[PDB]
Design a protein around this ligand. Structure first.
Ligand code: HEM
Ligand code: HEM
Lengths: 714, 714
């Protein structure tokens, strides 16, 4: 007996549970737990020493191929980081969520349950000093190093999650290993990072199970791009990874493997895919259903993959597991590789349709030829791509911990420059605050600008935020939602204030535009509250610096461009899913709870910080005054709402007892009076004794968002 | 676009989301919000005056029948409290969850969205001073009073929830108004309070929609019984309720009513069942699909319902709504009632199959006849039953607030006596603990006894707990799970200690057996910790008292008897659901989170507090020593687990290589190493640096459970 969720009865119901996840922290760990502090206590080199010993310590319940677990661990690390999507920054290795459903049970993660299990003794030994997330990646690096390849570096700092990321939409499919997201290769439904449900990137057999390398390349390119990787990085990663190990498919997994972890017998204690006629295995292991090694020396770094792929012609065939795979035409490669477990048996190398794709696609082929001709270039590209792959969702350099962090900071870290001046103090803070309020800048202008600056933050991959003032740079300065010409006016005035202040300084003190933006919005909010009769002081943290275009990868920021922005009541005219759904999704990126989001939306509407200064949802007669008017008017039964004709997200509020129009609103405003849970929150804020509470709650949420990307002291 | 839940992929996946609700207080309310303190500031009289004013203030969007909203409100309050189930104490009006899905959209709650909406202005006016939960019941009371019937009393104190109760299992059906819970009237699947999914108690047309009065009576009796009501209380309630208002069904609801609230357009702002002729059309009003009043004066308390039912013959027929209903076989009742909205029209009374059932069923008939002959008794019974109905889930008298709380305390409140003596101090506390440990009682006995006393509590209806020491009284003293013979010995020793402590005091101090039971439990936990090398002090709050059999309804406590007890590793051999499912269900009644449950079970296993002192889950060589051995040994891959032959609950833990049988366990123990989320918690406690952490976490949880029912000091 399991409680039938409301999700079942009503598929269109909003998923507020993702916001409830932000209310607190699930897990037995304290709320003030600083993983960074703990990891710093870790003896990294001792963990690496134990990992290197593990590489060749074969366990009977899952015998190491070729007497070395290295390749398995690399796949484990690759898969952990391989679910990452640039669209929302979700997925990835940062929380080690491969350990929880549904990811722990995807077909593509088959037997990684054994791989993670092999690390349990080490995890237990170091305890809190190293998270599962950090450990899985470290295990991959150690595997690579132990097999002859020097890595680019390694950083700790990934805090373990204790459940699935409920905000992630992995696709529309109702069954794993099936796809309803693309008709033509290269045209996958927007957002999704994979071409098939339950897979990391693409089908190893080819699009729709067809061994068409050329088409495969189209999906490879698109999925990797959606995972932040270009053509060169993609080829380097695939070739680099397949230089090691083999694929397992002694027989058809469909009829020889037991239930996935989430559906397996309790006695199996978290493991799954138990062989119908097996529980350990080696010379008969079954994982993907495809069988064989890529190179003659699966546990050594070399040019084996690249040479085998490019130096011989391959042909498609059905392997022993009933899946598509390619075999060489020459007899030289016949039985050229030792068997994984039987010392007296040999095996012939094989390629996946996805490997042949790198040889068939003109663009990838150009890269592969270059790699074959210049091994050093191949190696460097692989080292850099692997580092990027595994650290892409960790944020700025401030969050990279440990003695193995590389001296070089990478552009994808969205690095911030050090401050070559003294931070302003309380006196200057007030000085600048007064100057801003004195300028011809309106409260709405200051609030909208500060929001545009801080609202890009994503707790998923730590990208975005007000620190750096990238709002003034490409592509943000030209985003439609930011109103380019209008923003230029505000920024010009603020930059004018920055200049006069710094030039009027005698010592070594200076102020950044990034801090001014936030100071302006804070001063504006306090002003809006004062206009309502409330005296509030929003805490300010100086220190933000101004990032330059030189260390800004403009194209990569396109992924942060919003299609919907509740605070500004901006809704793109072509969104697929309902507006409120996107609203909840974005609110989760800011670590907001359902109540916080509500206070933020309602409070912002009284200020009037709408995109293009419309009156959508502005249910008040005192613009730029922080009150609970939004809620009072929203809840008034004296008003009747109806969809606006010739408008997709627009609605009109008309006098009920009559019929005249009183208000204009969007689905974003109305969801708070329609959703059962949100309406209960609105009723609290709309009561005759809650205005002060809404004001203070708005301020608490505003302050929180302004400081989301300040890891300077985290 | 909504992320597919893991529950969907794996239907048998433990619903841990129910425990996640206990790790956070969703809603905009402050963390230190004391509703009791806020309600005490309320002017109850003023709210009642506003409510009485509303009764006759017809709103155009939902015209009042006979110009009086009273009946509608009675139904609203009745349905709010009517979902209560004695089995788990869940459902009911204490949280006002009728406002959230799925209840807010149940077919039986049609148009109650309009009823609650009429109360919004009042709710907003008084704000936090009165919860929706208290206001809905208060509205029903004022409605009754305004129509000539004084209520027995009223208590405030129901704190509003902000989400549905995810732990409640409303039934197996996948469709509303359908039933897959009974194959014969009176034989409803146990654990359910209704005979049909989406109804409060039973189908108004009769079992399976057949107008069979006698058959209907069987379901009415069983459903009301499962809602703590007997024959006389049931007849009083139904008769008293139907003395007011009418049923609405001008046309088929399956054709003229729009989507339920959760499925309605956003512009409806939380409303539903939109009438395709206009809601303002009082004459076209449709709710249940049945049309007509029960009495000649629907807005007046009188003997009209009983007289119409017993004094006239009724015959089955199809109403204007296409539903089965009954009409007078005579003609002196035709058009004897004025129309609810048309001044120049009349209407004939009607009866529901459920009403005729009270006339056909022998037992119900006897009660009704007695009522007709003694109107005073009918009133007396209805008044008390209504009070019980609307306050049954509020707990002990300590929780009843306000000037309208009766002087008399009812046995269903599980009342506790006052302590006519001074409470013990710190020195006496320490002395008693030392004395208990010095007795012949072992650490295990003391822990098991303290748990037996406190584990009965349930946050749902505030029943159970260690206060009152009802463990020593029927029926608890004889529950198989409490091991009667062993229990009598432990309690005998504690009682002797109580006696000697009391007789030795020279002042007016005394200690209760209730407090001694919990202190000996704390003492034992501290001893266990000390045995492991840890000095811990468990916070103890004196004040518990000893309740007697005179104020204990033994039969009502049967609902508190556990079928599964994780702490004691007790599993009844006839449960329907998997043991771990019941475990989670029970953990929620104790307000435990996933981590708390894990620390508790793990810690208890090292102590060894099992039922019948089995070695089930006791993975340690040092019993009565609080350590993390349960987690260390559970997670050791050197051990393999398999079902035990000839045993429905046991599993054997064997050494993978030697075949040595090392441990024995149940699903209760093994789930912590199988479920993905629980495994992550276990891995934390099972680390080499976490034994101290486990100890503190176990102690915090233990202390939490021991004080669950401490309302006295609030
Ligand atoms: C077009 C993208 C790719 C596809 C479709 C893919 C495919 C697969 C499949 C089907 C397997 C076999 C699973 C099994 O039977 O055991 C495998 C394993 C392997 N993959 Fe890839 N992969 C891709 C990319 C990558 C990347 C980017 C890396 C890491 C730089 C990597 C590294 C490995 C390693 C080391 C193994 C061998 C594991 C072992 O020996 O146990 N792969 N891959
Ligand atoms: C065997 C149990 C019962 C059945 C199945 C049932 C039946 C129903 C149905 C079918 C309706 C009409 C809904 C509508 O069309 O507007 C109604 C309403 C009504 N019920 Fe009952 N009920 C039960 C008992 C109770 C109890 C215990 C009380 C409260 C003490 C009460 C209260 C009322 C009142 C006041 C109304 C009329 C509402 C109005 O005029 O709007 N009922 N009931």
């Amino acid at each position: 007996k399991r409680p039938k969720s409301n999700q079942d009865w009503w598929p269109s119901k909003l998923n507020l549970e993702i916001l409830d996840q932000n209310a607190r922290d699930v897990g037995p760990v304290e709320d003030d737990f600083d993983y960074a502090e703990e990891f710093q206590k870790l003896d990294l080199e001792a963990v690496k020493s134990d990992l290197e010993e593990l590489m060749t310590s074969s366990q009977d319940w899952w015998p190491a191929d070729y007497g070395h677990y290295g390749p398995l661990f690399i796949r484990m690390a690759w898969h952990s980081a391989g679910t990452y999507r640039t669209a929302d920054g979700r997925g990835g290795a940062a929380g080690g969520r491969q350990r929880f459903a549904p990811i722990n049970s995807w077909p593509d993660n088959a037997n990684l349950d054994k791989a993670r299990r092999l690390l349990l003794p080490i995890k237990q030994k170091y305890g809190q000093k190293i998270s599962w997330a950090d450990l899985m990646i470290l295990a991959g690096n150690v595997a690579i190093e132990s097999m002859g390849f020097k890595t680019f570096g390694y950083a700790g700092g990934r805090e373990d999650a204790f459940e699935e990321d409920k905000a992630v939409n992995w696709g529309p499919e109702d069954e794993f290993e099936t796809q309803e997201r693309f008709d033509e290769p290269g045209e996958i439904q927007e957002g999704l990072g994979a071409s098939v449900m339950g897979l990391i990137y693409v089908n190893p057999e080819g699009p729709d199970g067809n061994p068409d390398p050329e088409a495969s390349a189209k999906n490879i390119r698109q999925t990797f791009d959606r995972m932040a990787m270009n053509d060169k990085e993609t080829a380097a990663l695939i070739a680099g990874g397949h230089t090691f190990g083999k694929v397992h498919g002694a027989d058809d997994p469909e009829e020889n493997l037991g239930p996935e972890p989430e559906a397996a017998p309790i006695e199996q204690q978290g493991l799954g895919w138990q062989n119908k006629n097996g529980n350990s295995k080696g010379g008969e292991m079954i994982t993907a259903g495809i069988e064989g090694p890529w190179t003659q020396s699966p546990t050594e770094w070399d040019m084996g993959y690249i040479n085998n792929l490019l130096d011989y012609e391959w042909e498609p065939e059905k392997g022993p597991g009933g899946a598509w795979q390619w075999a060489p035409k020459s007899e030289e490669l016949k039985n050229s590789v030792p068997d994984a477990h039987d010392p007296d048996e040999k095996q012939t190398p094989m390629m996946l349709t996805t490997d042949i794709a790198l040889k068939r696609d003109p663009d990838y082929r150009e890269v592969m030829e270059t790699f074959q001709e210049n091994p050093m270039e191949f190696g460097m590209n692989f080292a850099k791509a692997w580092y990027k792959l595994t650290h892409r969702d960790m944020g700025p350099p401030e969050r990279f911990l440990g003695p193995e962090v590389p001296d070089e900071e990478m552009i994808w870290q969205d690095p911030l420059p050090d401050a070559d001046y003294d931070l302003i103090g309380d006196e200057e803070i007030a000085e600048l605050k007064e100057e801003i309020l004195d300028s011809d800048l309106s409260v709405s202008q200051l609030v909208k600008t500060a929001w545009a600056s801080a609202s890009t933050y994503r707790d998923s991959d730590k990208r975005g935020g007000a620190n750096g003032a990238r709002l003034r740079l490409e592509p943000q300065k030209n985003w439609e939602v930011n109103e380019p010409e209008q923003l230029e006016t505000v920024l010009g005035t603020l930059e004018n204030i920055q200049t006069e202040f710094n030039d009027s300084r005698s010592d070594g003190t200076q102020v950044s535009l990034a801090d001014l933006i936030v100071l302006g919005g804070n001063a504006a909010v306090e002003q809006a509250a004062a206009n309502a009769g409330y005296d509030v002081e929003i805490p300010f943290e100086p220190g933000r610096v101004d990032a330059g275009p030189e260390h800004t990868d403009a194209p990569s920021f396109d992924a942060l461009k919003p299609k919907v922005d509740g605070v500004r009541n901006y809704i793109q005219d072509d969104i697929t899913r309902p507006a409120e759904e996107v609203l909840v999704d974005n609110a989760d990126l800011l670590n907001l709870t359902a109540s916080e989001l509500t206070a933020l939306i309602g409070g912002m509407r009284s200020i009037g910080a709408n995109y293009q200064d419309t009156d959508l949802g502005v249910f008040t007669d005192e613009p730029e005054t922080l009150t609970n008017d939004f809620f009072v008017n929203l809840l008034d039964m004296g008003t009747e709402w109806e969809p606006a004709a010739d408008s997709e997200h627009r609605y009109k509020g008309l006098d009920r007892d009559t019929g005249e129009v009183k208000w204009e609103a969007t689905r974003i405003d109305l969801i708070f009076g329609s959703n059962d849970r949100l309406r209960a929150i609105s009723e609290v804020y709309g009561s005759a004794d809650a205005e002060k509470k809404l004001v203070h709650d708005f301020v608490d949420t505003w302050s929180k968002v302004m400081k989301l990307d300040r890891f300077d002291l985290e």
